[PDB]
UniProtKB/Swiss-Prot annotation, chain A:
Domain of life: Viruses
Protein name from the UniProt record: Spike glycoprotein
Highest classification ranks of the organism: Viruses, Riboviria, Orthornavirae, Pisuviricota, Pisoniviricetes
Stated consequence of mutating residue 29 to A: No effect on O-glycosylation by host GALNT1
Free-text description of this protein's post-translational modifications in UniProt: The cytoplasmic Cys-rich domain is palmitoylated. Palmitoylated spike proteins drive the formation of localized ordered cholesterol and sphingo-lipid-rich lipid nanodomains in the early Golgi, where viral budding occurs. Specific enzymatic cleavages in vivo yield mature proteins. The precursor is processed into S1 and S2 by host furin or unknown proteases to yield the mature S1 and S2 proteins. Processing between S2 and S2' occurs either by host CTSL in endosomes, or by host TMPRSS2 at the cell surface. Both cleavages are necessary for the protein to be fusion competent. Cell surface activation allows the virus to enter the cell despite inhibition of the endosomal pathway by hydroxychloroquine. The polybasic furin cleavage site is absent in SARS-CoV S.
Curated annotation (Swiss-Prot), chain E:
Residues listed as glycosylation sites in the UniProt record: 83, 107, 143
Bridged cysteine pairs (disulfide): 41-52, 91-135
Gene: S
Effect of mutating residue 127 to H: In strain: Alpha/B.1.1.7
Shown chain mapped onto the complete sequence: 992 to 1140 of 1273
Record protein name field: Spike protein S2'
Function noted in UniProt: Subunit of the fusion protein that is processed upon entry into the host cell. Mediates fusion of the virion and cellular membranes by functioning as a class I viral fusion protein. Contains a viral fusion peptide that is unmasked after S2 cleavage. This cleavage can occur at the cell membrane by host TMPRSS2 or during endocytosis by host CSTL. In either case, this triggers an extensive and irreversible conformational change that leads to fusion of the viral envelope with the cellular cytoplasmic membrane, releasing viral genomic RNA into the host cell cytoplasm.
Outcome of swapping residue 36 to I: In strain: Gamma/P.1
Domain of life: Viruses
Length: 85, 220, 198, 50, 149
């Protein structure tokens, strides 16, 4: 690989999502351990034309989670006691 | 000299006069934002001591400093890949433009990928890539330049063929002079203004995109 | 691995404390890492040198720990400022910002407390079951161009309707939902259809 | 001048008074053998992260 | 002597790692800003002033750059402005008329209603105006006819 030499992984021609990052577009996964060039996404071709539109006829109410850290553990270190006791 | 902030502009304010625009300019501006750095890893033992065994034996008296330095650099290195992932990998569908580039007079050749180039980059992206020039190792980025270009190509194809619909759900196709009219309604201008003056707006957009390429090529 | 962001912060803080505690076991070139052993074994002229080596090593370790603690504090402060912005704009109001309050068209949000963190449940509207229609920018009627006030002209193949942009609800093209600007000679792609008068 | 490296043939033409070679970062990357006046490149050994 | 070299090189390495961490924090902030611009300027139209270029933002296009992103912000800039005499409301039949979506303008002799961001004069009718109250309350109300379709 461009990242280096990878020993113990079977290189495959299929593209999957990245499970374990190797680098330079190479990722590894377990299915034995395989190494592959990661796919970016499923390929979708939008049917563009100059006089056609796509209108939704239905909807999905989707609830998603977003986790954000706010604070840490408040730690205090007695410098004199830590260095000298 | 003493610097001057700007030219004075006394606005002609009165209690019963208004200024209404009679025309418009489609202006394209550049914003350059850094995303990631070079991922560097340092072998602490080799940097301090090289191959000297006595130096490493004396270095063991200082404890786990080397482990902390390596772990901090590893955190920075994975943070760069996370930064690139957050910026460019915002779509899970790789969109493509149609083979016929009929967008109602709007030209995107300077921003769409060039099939003639082996790197599959846009002329603007090609110009941007041309204009940027002991225990130490440089880790390669997880996303190569080709895949980042592919992500930008997918984003461009989505925003050209589908409007803002692909960012909120499935990509719903819409003609580009209708997408532009929707954007005109977003800034409070009626659709008729866009439709009646569609050729002039397309010409202004193409001229502005060309000026962007010329300005990037002409400014160090 | 859903709650990995909070656990990462907890693990980093615990690991920094463990490293700082572990650094006391290192002698930093002195005869011993224990101060009591040096004070009980040596006269003050050489015990001063050994204690000085321990002091400079421990002081360097503590300064390093405080430096990464301040950097992590800056990162956590930035994350908390972002969380406060999300609480103000997604929970206390409806945000027009794309992808700031979830994937899709944002409707509302719910805050949930988490250990050292916040979890936002973003309720969003996702369009689904899209259908193709033939569209036109304007309708030509009586030598006048008609444009939708709030919707879009669609055609199912034979008949023309006007619908809202984000949901298919076909309605008869009338004067109530269209406005007239100019004739039919300027707009590119205008089609001929009747406009009903109530 | 001591060190560890791979000594390969060099295409750098030294001037006759010069003995060692340095890069931008002041590391010895070229050298002249004292017995036979030939120029050798010193490539660092292939260190890597496992 | 080796101990002196070790402590000097260790101090140099700690200095390098500390400044790399500070620069990493700066680059992370810039990348978070770039991701916000990618979400809000490219994947949608933003009403935030000067977030996606100077002017009224229409759309944006992303371009890859070495270690970076370049946003081409396509914006609408008003131009060729013209003076008009304006009024808050039109007095007709003892009623005050206010514009539904635009603004009342006058070219000197005649009164029209136009959209705020572009000059498109239209006849003041009951379709583009709404009635609230009489003419005695609004300061600066002027007398003009209101056409009925
Ligand atoms: C709208 O029409 C287009 C073409 O009539 C459809 O696009 C085709 O979709 C099929 C089904 O997935 C594909 O196999 C074809 O390759 C597509 N053709 C093109 C040119 O893109 C599109 O699916 C229709 N949209 C809807 C919502 O039904
Ligand atoms: C819109 O979508 C909803 C679900 O996304 C559809 O509701 C389903 O309808 C089928 C058949 O009527 C039922 O078997 C399911 O149980 C329904 N699901 C739910 C959650 O109610 C609805 O029919 C769709 N409407 C249209 C017009 O397509
Ligand atoms: C609107 O009218 C005002 C006043 O009649 C104009 O302001 C004058 O502009 C000229 C030329 O720039 C100056 O010499 C005057 O001093 C200005 N007068 C005041 C009171 O500021 C203004 O230019 C007009 N607007 C337009 C678009 O022509
Ligand atoms: C609005 O501005 C555009 C340019 O910004 C004008 O278009 C120019 O018109 C002149 C004279 O008609 C031509 O010589 C130029 O070649 C045109 N330029 C372009 C780019 O098309 C337009 O005429 C203006 N319209 C009004 C009503 O003022
Ligand atoms: C879109 O823009 C491109 C470039 O701005 C146009 O390509 C130019 O075409 C003219 C005439 O054929 C040539 O003289 C130029 O050398 C071309 N430039 C480049 C960079 O190739 C193109 O014609 C425009 N229109 C379409 C429909 O693609
Ligand atoms: C497009 O929609 C219109 C209205 O929904 C359809 O017109 C109706 O079609 C049904 C079934 O053929 C008839 O029973 C009605 O009398 C029609 N209404 C009118 C006012 O004509 C039309 O058939 C649809 N076209 C297509 C191709 O689906
Ligand atoms: C839409 O309607 C207009 C007017 O009803 C049509 O324009 C006429 O076209 C015929 C033949 O091309 C001419 O003889 C007339 O002089 C035109 N009249 C006007 C007022 O322009 C137009 O052809 C129709 N378009 C379609 C696609 O049916
Ligand atoms: C203000 O605008 C109105 C309408 O655009 C002008 O009224 C027209 O003026 C022309 C030229 O004198 C006449 O041929 C038309 O008959 C007028 N229309 C009507 C309905 O009266 C008016 O002249 C403009 N006033 C100024 C001072 O420019
Ligand atoms: C606008 O119209 C109103 C009513 O038509 C005017 O009010 C009249 O003013 C005259 C003299 O100023 C009085 O004699 C009437 O009794 C008033 N009538 C009412 C109903 O108040 C008003 O003056 C007009 N304003 C302008 C600027 O012309
Ligand atoms: C769309 O393209 C077709 C040919 O592909 C052309 O006949 C038609 O006039 C075009 N319509 C518009 C609105 O550009
Ligand atoms: C506007 O100012 C003029 C003086 O220039 C004054 O005569 C007039 O009454 C004012 N109108 C309003 C509505 O304040």
């Amino acid at each position: 690989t461009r990242a280096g030499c990878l020993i113990g992984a079977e290189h495959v021609n299929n593209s999957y999502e990245c499970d374990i990052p190797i680098g330079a577009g190479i990722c590894a996964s377990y299915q034995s351990i395989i190494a592959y060039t990661m796919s970016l996404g499923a390929e979708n071709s939008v049917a563009y034309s100059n006089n056609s539109i796509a209108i939704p006829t239905n909807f999905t109410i989707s609830v998603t989670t977003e986790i954000l850290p706010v604070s840490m553990t408040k730690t205090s270190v007695d410098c004199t006691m830590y260095i000298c006791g | 000299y003493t610097m001057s902030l700007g030219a004075e502009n006394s606005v002609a304010y009165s209690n019963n006069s208004i200024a209404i625009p009679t025309n418009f300019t489609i202006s394209v501006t550049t914003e350059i934002l850094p995303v990631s750095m070079t991922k560097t890893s340092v072998d602490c033992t080799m940097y301090i001591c090289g191959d000297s065994t006595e130096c490493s034996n004396l270095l063991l008296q200082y404890g786990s400093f080397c482990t902390q330095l390596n772990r901090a650099l590893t955190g920075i290195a994975v943070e760069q890949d996370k930064n690139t992932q957050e910026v460019f990998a915002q779509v899970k569908q790789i969109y493509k433009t149609p083979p016929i580039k009929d967008f109602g007079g709007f030209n995107f050749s300077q921003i769409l990928p060039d099939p003639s180039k082996p790197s599959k980059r846009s002329p603007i992206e090609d110009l941007l890539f041309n204009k940027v020039t002991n225990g130490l190792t440089v880790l390669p980025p997880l996303l190569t330049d080709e895949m980042i270009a592919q992500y930008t190509s997918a984003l461009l194809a989505g925003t050209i063929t589908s409007g803002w619909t692909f960012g909120a759900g499935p990509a719903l196709q819409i003609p580009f002079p209708m997408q532009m009219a929707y954007r005109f309604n977003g800034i409070g201008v009626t659709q008729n203004v866009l439709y009646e003056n569609q050729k002039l707006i397309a010409n202004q957009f193409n001229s502005a995109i060309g000026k962007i390429q010329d300005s990037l090529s002409s400014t160090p | 691995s859903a709650l990995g962001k909070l656990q990462d912060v907890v693990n980093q803080n615990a690991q920094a404390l463990n490293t700082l505690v572990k650094q006391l076991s290192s002698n930093f070139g002195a005869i011993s890492s224990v101060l009591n052993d040096i004070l009980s074994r040596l006269d003050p002229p050489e015990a001063e040198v050994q204690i000085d080596r321990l002091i400079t090593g421990r002081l360097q370790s503590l300064q390093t720990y405080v430096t990464q603690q301040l950097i992590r504090a800056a990162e956590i402060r930035a994350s908390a400022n972002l969380a406060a912005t999300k609480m103000s704009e997604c929970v206390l109001g409806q945000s027009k910002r794309v992808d700031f309050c979830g994937k899709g068209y944002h409707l509302m949000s719910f805050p949930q407390s988490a250990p050292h963190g916040v979890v936002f449940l973003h309720v969003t509207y996702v369009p689904a079951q899209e259908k193709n229609f033939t569209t036109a920018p304007a309708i030509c009627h009586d030598g006048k161009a008609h444009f939708p006030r709030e919707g879009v002209f669609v055609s199912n193949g034979t008949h023309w309707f006007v619908t809202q942009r984000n949901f298919y609800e076909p309605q008869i093209i009338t004067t109530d939902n269209t406005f007239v600007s100019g004739n039919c000679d300027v707009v590119i792609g205008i089609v001929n259809n009747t406009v009903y008068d109530p | 001048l001591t060190g560890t490296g791979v000594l390969t043939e060099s295409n750098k033409k030294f001037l006759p008074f010069q003995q060692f070679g340095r890069d931008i970062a002041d590391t010895t990357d070229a050298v002249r053998d004292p017995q036979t006046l030939e120029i050798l490149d010193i490539t660092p050994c292939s260190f890597g992260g496992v």
